Amino acid sequence: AEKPKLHYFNARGRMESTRWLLAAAGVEFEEKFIKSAEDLDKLRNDGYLMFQQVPMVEIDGMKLVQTRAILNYIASKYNLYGKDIKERALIDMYIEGIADLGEMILLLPVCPPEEKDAKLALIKEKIKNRYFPAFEKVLKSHGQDYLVGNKLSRADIHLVELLYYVEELDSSLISSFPLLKALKTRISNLPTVKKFLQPGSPRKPPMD
Amino acid sequence: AEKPKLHYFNARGRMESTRWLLAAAGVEFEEKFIKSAEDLDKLRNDGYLMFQQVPMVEIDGMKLVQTRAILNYIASKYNLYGKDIKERALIDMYIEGIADLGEMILLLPVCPPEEKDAKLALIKEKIKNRYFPAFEKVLKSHGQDYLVGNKLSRADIHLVELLYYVEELDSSLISSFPLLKALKTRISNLPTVKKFLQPGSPRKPPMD
């Protein structure tokens, strides 16, 4: 049995959400860290990167690039992508909103120092006024433990991962959203997640 | 029978790829154009936009937002998303590469005049050295008419749509890629595509 190998820098970056998805699915993976530019060029020259970039994940005989292609495959393979086309549409809608917000938090470190302030103010404004209220309303509407189909899916995983990043940004943001707090707790206690949240797991630290 | 209604500005924007997908699938749709800010605010206040933004597509009882959620649903519903999990992984990988490049061409008009030159030079460099060679190699590898599974899929549609935008940017770019030229012709002749490519179709013009 082959363990998926994740090729990327030893960092959170664009590979973290995949790390969380595999860990939450209970899948064990190997990481092949890119230390130098020589490493990245070697991957390219071996014809391992379709569009010359990483993340790249070797899984089930394929060398998948593009974060979304990778996450979609894994979510499908481990039954984290809903029950049908309608459920996947809700999942996709929610996780694409999460990915818009997450793209902002992700690029924040590479943000121009002069902009680094308004950017971070924009991010917090969007979190309070757009995203958190949206997800809180979904949880509030059905009163269920999970975002979609009363069953664990990538939506819950991706959202909880994002709630940890927001917490790192400003622990006060989630305060007015009890249902999101509850979901964060509930998901963090899932055996697979808790183990990943523990020291020594493949989870990566904030980029400094 | 309900016809999907696309809510957006009377423009290409982020709604165009959906327009191409529905047209290529042979689905008839209605467009509810947003003329003023009052229109957009009305949609928001009606609770029609989950994350307060458009594109928004009313289809099968749902009000879907997020381009990818919309396209995924439509591609699945009309059998344009491959046969299985493995085929969808190739499709996703290819179309996410197309979407990275397309995001660049899409934002080009809103690009700072001082940057508008290097940006456009970066786009052309990536097209010649990264994306086109990648897709040409896929077509070359299996020698089939379609990108994935020897059957028409959203990958072919999304790629061909992108080839029209590149043509508008610089007709010379596709010259060294005969297989991509062939695919563009072959797909443009599909009855549904040809009709959409004809004057008077819902297809939108370049943003000026």
| Residue A142 in tokens | 């059905």
Q: Which positions in chain B touch A86 (Cβ < 8 Å)?
A: 60, 62
Could you tell me if B166 and B127 are in contact, meaning their C-beta atoms sit under 8 angstroms apart?
Answer: yes
What's the CA gap between A55 and A21, in Å, rounded? 14
Task: Set out the domains of chain A in order of their start, with CATH numbers.
Answer: 1-80+190-208 (3.40.30.10), 81-189 (1.20.1050.10)
> What are the b/e assignments for B60-70, b being 16+ CB within 10 Å?
eebbbbbbbbb
What's the CA gap between B27 and B24, in Å, rounded? 8
Experimental method: X-ray
How far is CA A182 from its chain centroid?
A: 19
Provide the 8-state DSSP code for A128: I
| Residue A44 in tokens | 């390219």
Contacts of A71 (CB under 8 A, 6+ apart): A17, A18, A21, A154
What's the CA gap between A26 and A78, in Å, rounded? 9
Task: Mutate one of B66, B94, B104 to test the A interface: name it (highest A CB count within 10 A).
Answer: B66
Write the CA distances from A145 to A151, A153, A180, integer angstroms: 8, 11, 10
What's the CA gap between B119 and B126, in Å, rounded? 11
Instruction: Return the sign of the alpha-carbon dihedral for residues A189, A194, A197, A198.
Output: positive
Could you tell me if A80 and A154 are in contact, meaning their C-beta atoms sit under 8 angstroms apart?
Answer: yes
What's the CA gap between B181 and B38, in Å, rounded? 43
Provide the 8-state DSSP code for A167: H
Q: What are phi and psi of B8, to 5 degrees?
A: -175, 175
In the block, tokens 């899916």 appear at A153
Q: Is A192 annotated as a binding residue?
A: no
How many residues does this entry show for chain A?
208
Nearest to B87 by CA among B143, B148, B137, B21: B148
Q: Is A14 annotated as a binding residue?
A: no
Q: Is A67 annotated as a binding residue?
A: yes
The data reach a resolution, in angstroms, of 2.5
The minimum CA-CA distance between B135 and chain A, rounded to whole Å, is 9
Could you tell me if A150 and A144 are in contact, meaning their C-beta atoms sit under 8 angstroms apart?
Answer: yes
Inter-chain contacts counted by CB atoms under 8 A, chains A and B: 79
Long-range contacts of B12-17 (CB under 8 A, 24+ apart): B12/B204, B12/B205, B12/B206, B12/B207, B13/B55, B13/B106, B13/B204, B13/B207, B14/B55, B14/B67, B14/B106, B15/B54, B15/B55, B15/B67, B16/B161, B16/B203, B16/B204, B17/B67, B17/B71, B17/B102, B17/B158, B17/B161
Amino acid at B43: L
Q: Do A89 and B134 touch (CB under 8 A)?
A: no
Q: Is B14 annotated as a binding residue?
A: no
What's the CA gap between B15 and B110, in Å, rounded? 17
With H, G, I as helix, E, B as strand and everything else as coil, classify residue A200.
Answer: coil
Contacts of A68 (CB under 8 A, 6+ apart): B68, B92, B96
Q: Which positions in chain B touch A85 (Cβ < 8 Å)?
A: 73, 76-77
